[PDB]
RNA sequence: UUUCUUUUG
RNA sequence: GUUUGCGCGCCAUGGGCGCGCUCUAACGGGUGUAAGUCCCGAACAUGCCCAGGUAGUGGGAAAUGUAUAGCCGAACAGCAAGGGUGUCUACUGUGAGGUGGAAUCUGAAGGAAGCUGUAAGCGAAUCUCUGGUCCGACGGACAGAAAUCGCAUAUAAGGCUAGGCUUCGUGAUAAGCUGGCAAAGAACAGUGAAGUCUAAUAACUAAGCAGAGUAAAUGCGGCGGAUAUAUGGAGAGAAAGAGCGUGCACCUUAAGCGUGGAGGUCUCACAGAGGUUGCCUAGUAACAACGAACUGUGAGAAGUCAGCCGAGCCCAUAGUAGUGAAGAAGUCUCUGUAAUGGGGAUGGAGCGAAGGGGCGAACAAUCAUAAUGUCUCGUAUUGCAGAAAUGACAACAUCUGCCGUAACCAAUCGGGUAAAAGGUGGUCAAAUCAAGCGAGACGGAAAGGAUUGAUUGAACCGCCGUAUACGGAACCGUACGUACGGUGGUGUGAGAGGUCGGAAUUUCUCAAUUAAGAGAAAUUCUUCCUACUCGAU
């Protein structure tokens, strides 16, 4: 019944296209993703049969190409009729749902009053599973044995089919925060259970403790395990605030995502990296790009500012570091538009690199339109027409 | 905001 | 491929060692046998304070200058022999080229042992104590080595910049430290260790704390050593210092003087070897390849001269220049280092170069040369859903943030947070039966066995010892400064040309005018070669 729709001619060439467009680790045996076709051409109708007869063994540890070939189709497979049982508040790892919708969603409830944050934290997921009970929860849905035993033997030994395994697992825990009544969201497998009252939470957090200990089997431990308010709650990278305007909560970077950010920065724009400042304006405006795509549902507005002014500075003591010598300074700055005798003298002052990049001369003589001209896109244009 | 020289990846 | 960078010889204006002569503390005194040393005295100018912010007067506490014989000479200025150019012009050569002019750059950290004048700086045996700096490699500080000990150090020690907050509100001398960091110096600015010295007079018109920012990596402490940028001081000290001149079979020196330049490259003239209707012998950087454009003899010109795996042999100037009897090679013998060495005695003549190529030992890297247990048929079972004949009972799952309070609440007032008041589901055990996937045991059919050779090491970063020179004592540098000895570290820059060697690609040939099956023409990538042009040291 379902056993072809596995191994659908069709749904196995979505699963090429999809596992050649990862471009995946070897595994084990070093084989690589571009002769995957000769693995198909040859050996490929010998494993159509031998998943038919279930004689297959999926080599184990670290995840080979054709594994997570047909991890995808199974994938593929199961991305229909089971989705339909998932809550609506599970954001993660299904088509058309990103972290964007569950900030938004959380945002409306925590406007809506229920402000007291359960966090739980289902660590390491896959080593204290109990297998059995994964099985017959697949087997709840499903009735062909062929695939509660191709995805046993996966489980003893990536892909796609992991984390759709975990989304299967924890949806028991959607359906009792639904049955209970309770406000939540769920990215993947850290939850958050949004409530207004205090010893309401105290009480979720023990009963969901107890809940996943006893009836889903699972294990949590102390070190993401709070209550706390927003103001003290760090979920997906976003930190949570008040505005002084008391009348919504908004949502904004967490600190830590913060210095992620500027370590990466720091390290994009070292001064003594030896390549060509377009290339480092490059990768810059990459980073900018996919660092404000993700968070741009988030008050940053200050953060930007801060933050262009850094990037600034940062560039233009790499300009200064790429010119090297004080006769090559003096003759950029006198070409960049300087009158020569402040140029001499701030170019014999060549030395000295953040003294003279964080005032004075330079700051016109590579300014925020040149800067802007020269490739980079300044943060606060590209957070507003994003936004 | 030192009207200076040299050395290095 | 970074102005110069090679060998040999001469020469001090460099340095020792003596011998004389003179001078040595503002200007003068004393003390004493003896003062260059020890002690004392006058004025002016500057710095600092008499402030409340500054100028100009009046005054004052330390300090410095005019002011020791003299030394040195800026990252100061001028001159400047010499060198270069791919810019132009003259001349001379048959030509490769040479020479003289202009114009410009240079005249350097290693010998015109460059010249002149400065700013600034320095300025006396020896001894005790003490501050600071530097050193006891390199190597993110392992390994490796002759090359300090312990600890810390990259999601970044430590330093530093701009703030913020909390405690609090005499100077001088001056090596050094820092000025947001690759390293080092100089200038300027701010601070400034150690001890000493002062702690006088009158007026006027800072320590901590958290952060944020910034790193081509060192930081802190002990121990040992050095310290003439005449290192900052302190205490002894009747102690030496400086200039000039002169000797010394005294010792040395990379841009000074003289003289050599092989090897390769290039020009010309004769002969041959060709092409052409007497003339051509090249060009494309060289290799290659087109092309007739190659070969010997002879005459010429420019010219060398950069450690990276290289003991040594070979080619040529060459056993020549040059040294050597004011004594070589060899031998013997005291020694020194990690290594290169240095004396003493015989002995009787030898010893002995330069640049560029090949060959290459050694070295490094790389490549080639008797179970157990799984596949596999049956047995006892067990891991996990669903179904409920039926029993045990009204206590259990689960959601809901509070009672009074100044007449009003977030402990904004006192106790508490499974805090009161409450809702919603009834809760647990199943007899037996039972989906689909497995988990090992219990058995027996079938397996199965725990030295040689080639290639590469292109280039580059350096440090250390001695000798020898400089910028700038130390440190950083001068091609690792250079020479000779020791040592680690990185890995094959872009173009262009050739190899179009090897692999793919387009088009033909064969297989069938069929493949990504073999061959050929072309294209692209790749291996290799080339300072030809750049790039790096
Ligand atoms: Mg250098
Ligand atoms: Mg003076
Ligand atoms: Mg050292
Ligand atoms: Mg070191
Ligand atoms: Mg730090
Ligand atoms: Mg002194
Ligand atoms: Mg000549
Ligand atoms: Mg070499
Ligand atoms: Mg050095
Ligand atoms: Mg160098
Ligand atoms: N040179
Ligand atoms: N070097």
């Given at each position: 019944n379902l056993m072809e729709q596995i191994l659908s001619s069709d749904n196995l060439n979505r699963a090429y296209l999809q596992v050649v467009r990862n471009k995946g680790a070897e595994g084990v045996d070093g084989m690589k993703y571009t002769e995957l076709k000769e693995h198909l051409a040859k050996n490929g109708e010998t494993i159509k049969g031998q998943l038919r007869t279930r004689k297959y063994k999926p080599q184990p540890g670290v995840p080979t190409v054709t594994d997570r070939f047909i991890q995808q189709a199974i994938a593929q497979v199961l991305t229909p009729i089971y989705e339909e049982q998932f809550h609506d508040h599970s954001y993660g790892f299904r088509p058309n749902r990103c972290a964007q919708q569950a900030i938004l969603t959380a945002l409306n409830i925590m406007n809506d009053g229920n402000d007291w944050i359960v966090d739980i934290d289902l660590e390491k997921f896959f080593d204290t599973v109990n297998h059995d009970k994964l099985m017959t929860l697949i087997g709840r849905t499903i009735k062909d044995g062929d695939v509660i035993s191709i995805v046993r033997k996966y489980l003893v030994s990536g892909g796609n089919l992991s984390p759709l395994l975990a989304n299967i697992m924890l949806n028991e825990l959607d359906k009792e925060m639904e049955k209970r009544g309770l406000n939540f969201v769920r990215y993947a497998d850290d939850c958050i259970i949004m409530v207004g009252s205090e010893m309401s939470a105290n009480r979720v957090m023990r009963n969901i403790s107890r809940f996943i200990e006893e009836k889903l089997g699972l294990k949590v431990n102390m070190t993401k395990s709070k209550v706390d308010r927003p103001s003290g709650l760090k979920y997906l990278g976003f930190g949570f605030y008040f505005d002084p305007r008391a009348h919504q909560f908004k949502a904004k970077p967490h600190a830590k995502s913060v210095a992620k950010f500027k370590k990466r920065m720091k390290e994009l724009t070292?001064?003594?990296?030896?390549?060509?400042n377009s290339y480092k304006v490059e990768k810059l405006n990459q980073l900018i790009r996919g660092w404000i795509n993700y968070f741009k549902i988030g008050s940053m507005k200050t953060l930007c500012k801060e933050l262009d002014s850094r990037i600034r500075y940062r560039l233009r003591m790499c300009i200064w570091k790429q010119w090297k010598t004080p006769q090559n300074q003096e003759k950029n700055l006198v070409k960049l538009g300087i009158d020569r005798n402040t140029a001499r003298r701030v170019a014999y002052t060549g030395k000295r690199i953040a003294y003279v990049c964080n005032k004075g001369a330079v700051n016109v003589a590579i300014s925020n339109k040149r800067l802007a001209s020269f490739g980079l896109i300044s943060m606060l244009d590209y957070y507003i027409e994003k936004c």
């Open positions: 070292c001064r003594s990296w030896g390549v060509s």
